[PDB]
Design an enzyme around this catalytic site. Structure first.
Site, mmCIF file in Angstrom:
data_model
loop_
_atom_site.group_PDB
_atom_site.id
_atom_site.type_symbol
_atom_site.label_atom_id
_atom_site.label_comp_id
_atom_site.label_asym_id
_atom_site.label_seq_id
_atom_site.Cartn_x
_atom_site.Cartn_y
_atom_site.Cartn_z
ATOM 1 N N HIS A 1 39.828 25.215 20.348
ATOM 2 C CA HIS A 1 39.015 23.946 20.289
ATOM 3 C C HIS A 1 37.695 24.006 19.529
ATOM 4 O O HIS A 1 37.045 22.946 19.384
ATOM 5 C CB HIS A 1 38.751 23.406 21.770
ATOM 6 C CG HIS A 1 40.003 22.989 22.472
ATOM 7 N ND1 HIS A 1 40.828 21.946 22.310
ATOM 8 C CD2 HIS A 1 40.329 23.581 23.661
ATOM 9 C CE1 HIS A 1 41.749 21.905 23.318
ATOM 10 N NE2 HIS A 1 41.387 22.865 24.200
ATOM 11 N N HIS B 1 36.675 25.319 29.081
ATOM 12 C CA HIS B 1 37.635 24.214 29.039
ATOM 13 C C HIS B 1 37.014 22.987 28.401
ATOM 14 O O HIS B 1 35.805 22.838 28.265
ATOM 15 C CB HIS B 1 38.083 23.910 30.559
ATOM 16 C CG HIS B 1 39.362 23.143 30.730
ATOM 17 N ND1 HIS B 1 40.614 23.538 30.457
ATOM 18 C CD2 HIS B 1 39.540 21.938 31.302
ATOM 19 C CE1 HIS B 1 41.517 22.688 30.774
ATOM 20 N NE2 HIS B 1 40.878 21.594 31.232
HETATM 21 C C1 LIG Z 1 44.841 28.243 32.755
HETATM 22 C C2 LIG Z 1 45.965 27.914 31.657
HETATM 23 C C3 LIG Z 1 47.397 27.983 32.094
HETATM 24 O O1 LIG Z 1 45.649 26.625 31.088
HETATM 25 C C4 LIG Z 1 45.642 26.462 29.582
HETATM 26 O O2 LIG Z 1 46.907 26.249 29.037
HETATM 27 C C5 LIG Z 1 47.582 25.051 29.506
HETATM 28 C C6 LIG Z 1 49.094 25.063 29.154
HETATM 29 O O3 LIG Z 1 49.666 26.168 29.928
HETATM 30 S S1 LIG Z 1 50.374 27.304 29.214
HETATM 31 O O4 LIG Z 1 49.682 27.650 28.020
HETATM 32 O O5 LIG Z 1 50.368 28.361 30.220
HETATM 33 O O6 LIG Z 1 51.776 26.971 28.949
HETATM 34 C C7 LIG Z 1 46.803 23.934 28.940
HETATM 35 O O7 LIG Z 1 47.313 22.602 29.449
HETATM 36 C C8 LIG Z 1 48.227 21.782 28.552
HETATM 37 O O8 LIG Z 1 47.303 21.025 27.615
HETATM 38 C C9 LIG Z 1 46.575 19.849 28.125
HETATM 39 C C10 LIG Z 1 45.416 19.468 27.178
HETATM 40 O O9 LIG Z 1 44.615 18.636 27.635
HETATM 41 O O10 LIG Z 1 45.264 20.079 26.062
HETATM 42 C C11 LIG Z 1 47.497 18.784 28.612
HETATM 43 O O11 LIG Z 1 47.482 17.701 27.704
HETATM 44 C C12 LIG Z 1 48.118 16.441 28.117
HETATM 45 O O12 LIG Z 1 47.231 15.695 29.047
HETATM 46 C C13 LIG Z 1 45.958 15.348 28.455
HETATM 47 C C14 LIG Z 1 45.262 14.704 29.610
HETATM 48 O O13 LIG Z 1 44.397 15.562 30.382
HETATM 49 S S2 LIG Z 1 42.909 15.592 30.087
HETATM 50 O O14 LIG Z 1 42.736 15.755 28.653
HETATM 51 O O15 LIG Z 1 42.428 16.766 30.806
HETATM 52 O O16 LIG Z 1 42.390 14.380 30.661
HETATM 53 C C15 LIG Z 1 46.251 14.413 27.268
HETATM 54 O O17 LIG Z 1 45.107 13.847 26.633
HETATM 55 C C16 LIG Z 1 47.053 15.216 26.248
HETATM 56 O O18 LIG Z 1 47.418 14.322 25.118
HETATM 57 C C17 LIG Z 1 48.404 15.634 26.839
HETATM 58 N N1 LIG Z 1 49.199 16.375 25.745
HETATM 59 S S3 LIG Z 1 50.882 16.254 25.921
HETATM 60 O O19 LIG Z 1 51.508 17.096 24.939
HETATM 61 O O20 LIG Z 1 51.274 14.871 25.706
HETATM 62 O O21 LIG Z 1 51.173 16.719 27.277
HETATM 63 C C18 LIG Z 1 48.963 19.311 29.069
HETATM 64 O O22 LIG Z 1 49.352 18.620 30.200
HETATM 65 C C19 LIG Z 1 49.032 20.837 29.426
HETATM 66 O O23 LIG Z 1 50.456 21.271 29.383
HETATM 67 S S4 LIG Z 1 51.377 21.121 30.655
HETATM 68 O O24 LIG Z 1 52.449 22.064 30.473
HETATM 69 O O25 LIG Z 1 50.611 21.463 31.815
HETATM 70 O O26 LIG Z 1 51.836 19.763 30.652
HETATM 71 C C20 LIG Z 1 45.354 24.008 29.421
HETATM 72 O O27 LIG Z 1 44.622 23.037 28.720
HETATM 73 C C21 LIG Z 1 44.698 25.374 29.232
HETATM 74 N N2 LIG Z 1 43.406 25.490 29.913
HETATM 75 S S5 LIG Z 1 42.355 26.419 29.066
HETATM 76 O O28 LIG Z 1 42.690 27.805 29.129
HETATM 77 O O29 LIG Z 1 41.038 26.205 29.614
HETATM 78 O O30 LIG Z 1 42.288 25.864 27.738
#
Ligand SMILES: CC(C)O[C@H]1O[C@H](COS(=O)(=O)O)[C@@H](O[C@@H]2O[C@@H](C(=O)O)[C@@H](O[C@H]3O[C@H](COS(=O)(=O)O)[C@@H](O)[C@H](O)[C@H]3NS(=O)(=O)O)[C@H](O)[C@H]2OS(=O)(=O)O)[C@H](O)[C@H]1NS(=O)(=O)O
EC number: 3.1.27.-
Length: 133
Positions: A15, A128
């Site tokens: 990001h 985050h």
């Molecule tokens: C701690 C770890 C596991 O978390 C990090 O990685 C996950 C995915 O897990 S994985 O890598 O182990 O497989 C990330 O979450 C995924 O990305 C989100 C994002 O915001 O980038 C999610 O996006 C969806 O929802 C958003 C709404 O939430 S908000 O922004 O918080 O309000 C939407 O705006 C976005 O468009 C949407 N994208 S989608 O493709 O249409 O889904 C997504 O839900 C999530 O994947 S899922 O498998 O859980 O569905 C974490 O962000 C990340 N945390 S980090 O380490 O801090 O970056």
């Protein structure tokens, strides 16, 4: 640490992007690393150094935040990029297809401690992303 980085570097690699490539490339940093293509992503044209300062601005709170009650917003604006999956039916890199969306807005982030083996100089670091305005 996550499998290949610290939390704080991994957060930057997804990001924080001062001089990015175009979206068809920029997306690869997760869409070619995770089991499916993500539809949308956001990439702030700033330095990590500002973001370490933003984890020393006044404490606020965010929509999905109860396990720390602590996030922060940036004190002045920065440029960015956003990317957009142009056909939601692709689930893999043989068919997922994107386009570019640049912009200048504030941003909102959450933050926690340093890593035992990296850059001790800073007691608290970002980790985050919630939104941009
Ligand atoms: C701690 C770890 C596991 O978390 C990090 O990685 C996950 C995915 O897990 S994985 O890598 O182990 O497989 C990330 O979450 C995924 O990305 C989100 C994002 O915001 O980038 C999610 O996006 C969806 O929802 C958003 C709404 O939430 S908000 O922004 O918080 O309000 C939407 O705006 C976005 O468009 C949407 N994208 S989608 O493709 O249409 O889904 C997504 O839900 C999530 O994947 S899922 O498998 O859980 O569905 C974490 O962000 C990340 N945390 S980090 O380490 O801090 O970056």
């Amino acid at each position: 640490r996550p499998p290949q980085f610290t939390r704080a570097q991994w957060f930057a690699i997804q990001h924080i992007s001062l001089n990015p490539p175009r979206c068809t490339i920029a997306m690869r940093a997760i869409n070619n690393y995770r089991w499916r293509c993500k539809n949308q992503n956001t990439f702030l044209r700033t330095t990590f150094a500002n973001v370490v300062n933003v984890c020393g601005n006044q404490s606020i709170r965010c929509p999905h935040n109860r396990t720390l009650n602590n996030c922060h917003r940036s004190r002045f604006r920065v440029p960015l990029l956003h990317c957009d999956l142009i056909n939601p039916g692709a689930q893999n890199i043989s068919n997922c297809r994107y386009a570019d969306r640049p912009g200048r807005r504030f941003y909102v982030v959450a933050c926690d401690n340093r890593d035992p083996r990296d850059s001790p100089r800073y007691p608290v670091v970002p980790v985050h992303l919630d939104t941009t305005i």
